[PDB]
């Protein structure tokens, strides 16, 4: 069944603008600007008023209609990124071996050492627009921060999956660095 | 129904099989066909389908002597040429003489860089439902062994820049021609009456 019309709207708080057209959005706020392309979906996106963006679909099937809220949530994430940003805190857990985490290449690469005592050095590059920092106060804590949630979470996932155990049971060899918290930069 | 010249067809945004069938019919009917930008032709369905189909095609080689087996061309132009060949009685003299009238190119050779190309609306990819993936023969050729994707891309970029400059000049001259007709109005008013009365403006 092809529903005649189905739409959703996103409302923008004060201080941020979107200026959408041709299915590419250009959200801008205090923390810069994020541009996202949504041309893989054949919906109609337009400005209705001053701070409302409407995403609409004519004659869509279940699978196409499922994407309206997806796009709206993506735009909401852009708003959050430009207002308060994104910050992922990850904790290192080990039984015996301290996981030594450092930054090199102009603070653009994360190096993991001593993970389970292996002499190999694990190198993870950081996506553009994302930064990293070790906590000097809270030990064993690494923070990856940025505007774009997609890239921030991709960097966090890269770091988390970089540390994996092999040939030993993960039910009790729990060593590794895990994403413990997902929050915003500005205290909410 | 024969065309005096060769038919120059811009391959961009055309469905492979539909364009191939139309071109094969024209070749059999006696025309010469030149297809430009064969790397811009598209095939319906996700990329994996086409990639696996071409891999299975690659697997077809003579066990005794692969130099005899099927010849798997990787260039987009040769891919389109073989697709058209499949739609012709190429094992007969008729089919051979028809196929020898086809020229398929990647990009726009300097010979045709200064001519107007055609499209077949019945073969455009925009007949597909918008929610339907499609692959590009350029990407398929690159992933199956074509070695000149970047060279063609650079040459096409230079061509597009030159064409944009030419079109800016042409826009200027067209505005000038409109102004010239406006100025000529007093002299041509006698003839414009007949033109408009017979409905031509």
């Amino acid at each position: 069944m092809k529903l005649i019309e189905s739409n959703d709207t996103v409302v923008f708080p004060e201080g941020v603008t979107f200026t959408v057209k041709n299915r590419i959005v250009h959200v801008t706020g205090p923390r810069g600007t994020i541009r996202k392309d949504f041309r893989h979906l054949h919906m109609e996106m337009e400005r209705i008023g001053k701070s409302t963006l409407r995403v609409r679909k004519w004659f869509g099937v279940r699978k196409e209609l499922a994407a309206i809220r997806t796009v709206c949530s993506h735009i909401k994430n852009m708003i959050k990124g430009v207002t308060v940003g994104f910050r992922y805190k990850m904790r290192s857990v080990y039984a015996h071996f301290p996981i030594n985490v450092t930054l090199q290449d102009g603070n653009r690469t994360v190096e993991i050492r001593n993970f389970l005592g292996e002499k190999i050095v694990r190198r993870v590059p950081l996506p553009e627009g994302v930064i990293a920092t070790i906590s000097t106060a809270q030990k064993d804590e690494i923070v990856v921060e940025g505007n774009d949630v997609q890239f921030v979470s991709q960097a966090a996932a890269r770091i988390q999956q970089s540390t994996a155990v092999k040939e030993k049971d993960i039910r009790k060899f729990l060593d590794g660095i895990y994403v413990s918290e997902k929050t915003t930069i500005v205290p909410t | 129904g024969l065309s005096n010249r060769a038919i120059i067809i811009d391959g961009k945004n055309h469905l492979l099989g539909r364009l191939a069938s139309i071109v094969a019919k024209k070749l059999l009917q006696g025309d010469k066909v030149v297809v430009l930008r064969a790397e811009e032709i598209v095939i319906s369905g996700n990329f994996h389908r086409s990639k696996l189909k071409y891999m299975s095609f690659l697997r077809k080689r003579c066990n005794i002597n692969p130099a005899r087996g099927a010849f798997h061309y990787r260039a987009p132009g040769k891919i389109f040429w073989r697709t058209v060949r499949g739609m012709l009685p190429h094992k007969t003299n008729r089919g051979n003489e028809a196929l020898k009238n086809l020229r398929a190119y990647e990009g726009v050779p300097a010979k045709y860089q200064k001519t107007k190309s055609l499209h077949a609306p019945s073969a455009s990819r925009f007949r597909l439902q918008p929610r339907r993936k499609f692959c590009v023969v350029g990407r398929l050729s690159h992933e199956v062994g074509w070695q000149f994707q970047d060279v063609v891309a650079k040459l096409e970029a230079k061509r597009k820049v030159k064409g944009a400059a030419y079109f800016e000049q042409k826009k200027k001259m067209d505005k000038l021609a409109v102004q010239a007709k406006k100025n000529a109005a007093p002299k041509i008013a006698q003839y414009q009456k007949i033109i408009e009365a017979l409905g031509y403006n």
């Binding site: 857990v93 729990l174 590794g176 895990y178 | -």
Partner: protein, 51 residues
């Protein structure tokens, strides 16, 4: 190691569901396997806990 870190690691390593047809590591609160090989089998078992 500290119990909160134990729990954090177990949340990713042990607290998951295993499909009984393809052994796919699946989310705990799941109803069907996400893998096409088993045809989205609806019968699953918890990942074997430390006994």
């Amino acid at each position: 190691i500290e119990p909160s870190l134990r729990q954090l690691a177990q949340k990713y390593n042990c607290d998951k569901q295993i499909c009984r047809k393809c052994y796919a590591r699946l989310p705990p609160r799941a109803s069907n396997c996400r893998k096409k090989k088993c045809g989205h089998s609806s019968e699953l078992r918890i990942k074997k806990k430390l006994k």
